[PDB]
């Protein structure tokens, strides 16, 4: 937390440096929060940025409705 | 007779600054006789760490549920047109690099050994982008998107349903859509206009990051405390002093700084009490007058609340309440009831109002005269048994129909 | 395991300093000792006070629960149950109360097209409760919250100004039930 390893799988976040995990490019649900966006999860362990969710962009339109 | 939108700012806390202190670091720190005799004492350090770690996770936790109310990212349509609406200045901005709108941006400029501040889990660009998604579900689904299945639906359609949910009819509105249009611009441009130029307007999370920097102040000066010793540093006593007393006026230092310890960990406790009760506040206001209208009056804003408009700031959130105020009254002669041929006639939603010479019914919040009819009146007994009747003729709606 | 704490003494049991220690320093150590167990009760005791008002806090937002949406009908949005609330079932549980919330949750939307309002014989025609929706080729009246197509009629809708001041209206007829009555 807030040391840098340079100096003692490696991915430097904001609060510091993971040692152990690697970093994926591809981002899924959170499991294990970790901090500063980017949480670590077991799948061997992955580090990964943190998903919102599935994304959904609605069709607004000036004279369209989808009633229930 | 007339009315007004007015926009208002409402400002609650939801989080602090996640702080991480440890006891063997603070108290001495790289004693190694400190740290042997800090061992006797118990389970304090761990206690106090446990302690820490819990209100850490607990505000990471309420951080998470006053924002992330919707599993749904949805995004804003190219098109910026709303029926003449300006949404410009809670919308983000794609040409700043943090995707934040001006508003969020002007919020943001407004505000300004051991211990460590824990970068917090929900960072500033999730959260706005939560706080987008937010703003886009509620202008293209209104209500719908927080209740299931995200619904298209026109911002005017969403109007009126609101204005029939507060107790308004749908005439009003598209017979002076540009004037309310322009009102609404009117009044953002107002109250952005306040917001530049009040710099109290913020003083909420002013207070609680003036708090807690002087709590960690206290802290950090409660270390150059003597404590009834000498100095407040140990290798002067341990090397000048003999151990049995030395021993005696470290325990006594170190007492002292764990009594501190203490009290600040309460402090921060019953802090960290306060502001879960605010985050709470702030979520049930979430949860009612934002995804959805509330019945309430005066609870997330002074009026007729219509809709609120959430806004990411810097360990809290600040809420754009746009409420319906009338104005412009005027002096009415009302009855009770209305006595027609020895039957006597109710209002199902108006009220009996009276210019001088002439009888209508009209709205409770807004002034509509009409033709007293038998659809808009139910007939419940006849006209004596009540108190202050006038006379006055119905008109039918059908016997014209039948009478030639 | 804070009664086997020391305290700076040389032991953990009180009878152990009273029979092995000189009492002018042994009153001394029984007093250090006292403190630092007056010290850890206190702390035990503000921590229970603190742990007391959160769950006074959570208790009165069950309470709240309670009286709002089990007794009654609350209107408040995912209040006490995700969507649009219809009722709660309370059940016992050991040290808490669980609910059984039950809400209604739409499904299977379609596409539709609406008009703010229909323009017959120059006059505007805007619905009380419902809302016109087109299919294509006819336009019809339904609530907000299902899908029940209707006749226009003007008993569900009322009249109130003209059509040229509002702004994206469509020309449609509206049926009206007398018309037949009197025709025959
Ligand atoms: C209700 O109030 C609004 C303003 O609060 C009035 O709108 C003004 O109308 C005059 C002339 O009609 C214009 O010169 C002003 O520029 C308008 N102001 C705004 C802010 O648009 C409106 O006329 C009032 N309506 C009634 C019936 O009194
Ligand atoms: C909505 O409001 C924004 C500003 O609040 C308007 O943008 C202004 O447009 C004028 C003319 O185009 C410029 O002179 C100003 O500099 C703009 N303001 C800013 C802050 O850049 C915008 O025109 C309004 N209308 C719409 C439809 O967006
Ligand atoms: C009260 O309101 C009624 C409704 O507008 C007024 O009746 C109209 O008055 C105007 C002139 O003032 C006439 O041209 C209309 O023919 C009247 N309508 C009907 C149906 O008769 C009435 O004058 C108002 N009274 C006062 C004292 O203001
Ligand atoms: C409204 O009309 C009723 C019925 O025409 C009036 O009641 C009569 O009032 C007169 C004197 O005002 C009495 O002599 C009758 O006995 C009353 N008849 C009944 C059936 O009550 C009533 O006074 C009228 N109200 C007003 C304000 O003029
Ligand atoms: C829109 O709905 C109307 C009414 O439900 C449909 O009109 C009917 O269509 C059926 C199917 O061919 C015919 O058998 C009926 O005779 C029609 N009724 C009338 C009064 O015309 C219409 O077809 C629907 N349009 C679309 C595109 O689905
Ligand atoms: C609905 O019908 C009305 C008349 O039945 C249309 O109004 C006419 O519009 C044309 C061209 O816009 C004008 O030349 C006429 O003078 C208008 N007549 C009247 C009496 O206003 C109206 O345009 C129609 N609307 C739609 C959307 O079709
Ligand atoms: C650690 O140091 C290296 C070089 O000394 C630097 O590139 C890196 O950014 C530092 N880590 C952090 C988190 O700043
Ligand atoms: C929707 O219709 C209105 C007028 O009815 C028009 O001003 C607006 O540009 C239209 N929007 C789109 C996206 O076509
Ligand atoms: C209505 O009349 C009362 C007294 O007759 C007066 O005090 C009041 O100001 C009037 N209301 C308006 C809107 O003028
Ligand atoms: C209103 O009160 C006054 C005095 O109390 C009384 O003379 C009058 O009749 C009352 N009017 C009505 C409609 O009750
Ligand atoms: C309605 O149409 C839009 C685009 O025309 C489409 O994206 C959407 O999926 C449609 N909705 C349904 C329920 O088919």
Redesign the pocket.
């Given at each position: 937390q807030g040391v840098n390893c340079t100096e003692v799988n490696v991915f430097q976040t904001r609060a510091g440096c993971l040692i152990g995990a690697e970093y994926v490019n591809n981002s899924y649900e959170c499991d294990i929060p970790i901090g500063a966006g980017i949480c670590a999860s077991y799948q061997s362990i992955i580090a990964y940025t943190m998903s919102l969710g599935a994304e959904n962009s609605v069709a607004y339109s000036n004279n369209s409705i989808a009633i229930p | 007779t007339n009315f007004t939108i007015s926009v208002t700012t409402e400002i609650l806390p939801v989080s602090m600054t996640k702080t991480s202190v440890d006891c063997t670091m603070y108290i001495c720190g790289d004693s190694t006789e400190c740290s042997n005799l800090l061992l006797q004492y118990g389970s304090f350090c761990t206690q106090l760490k446990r302690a820490l770690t819990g209100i850490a996770v607990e505000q990471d936790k309420n951080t998470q549920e006053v924002f992330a109310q919707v599993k749904q990212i949805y995004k804003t349509p190219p098109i910026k047109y709303f029926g003449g609406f300006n949404f410009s200045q809670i919308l983000p901005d794609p040409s700043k690099p943090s995707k934040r709108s001006p508003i969020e941006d002007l919020l943001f400029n407004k505000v300004t050994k051991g211990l460590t501040v824990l970068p917090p889990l929900l960072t500033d660009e999730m959260i706005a982008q939560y706080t987008s998604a937010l703003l886009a579900g509620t202008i293209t689904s209104g209500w719908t998107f927080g209740a299931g299945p995200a619904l298209q639906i026109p911002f005017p359609m969403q109007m009126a349903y609101r204005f029939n949910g507060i107790g308004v009819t749908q005439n009003v509105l598209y017979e002076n859509q540009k004037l309310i249009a322009n009102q609404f611009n009117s009044a953002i441009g107002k109250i952005q206009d306040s917001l530049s130029s009040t710099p109290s307007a913020l003083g909420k999370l002013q207070d609680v990051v003036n708090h807690n920097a002087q709590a960690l102040n206290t802290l950090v000066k409660q270390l150059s405390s003597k404590f009834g010793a000498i100095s407040s540093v140990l290798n002067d006593i341990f090397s000048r002093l003999d151990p049995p007393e030395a021993e005696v006026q470290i325990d006594r230092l170190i007492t002292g700084r764990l009594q501190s310890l203490q009290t600040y960990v309460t402090q921060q406790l019953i802090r960290a009490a306060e502001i879960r009760a605010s985050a709470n506040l702030a979520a049930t206001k979430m949860s009612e007058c934002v995804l959805g209208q509330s019945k309430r009056v005066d609870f997330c804003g002074k009026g007729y609340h219509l809709m609120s408009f959430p806004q990411s700031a810097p360990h809290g959130v600040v809420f754009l309440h746009v409420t319906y105020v009338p104005a412009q009254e005027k002096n009415f002669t009302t009855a009770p009831a209305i006595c027609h041929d020895g039957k006597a006639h109710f209002p199902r939603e108006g009220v009996f109002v009276?210019?001088?010479?002439?009888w209508?019914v009209t709205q409770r919040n807004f002034y509509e005269?009409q033709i007293i009819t038998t659809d808009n009146t139910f007939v419940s007994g006849n006209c004596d048994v009540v108190i202050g009747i006038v006379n006055n003729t119905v008109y039918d709606p059908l016997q014209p129909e039948l009478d030639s």
């Open positions: - | 009276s210019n001088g010479t002439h209508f005269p």
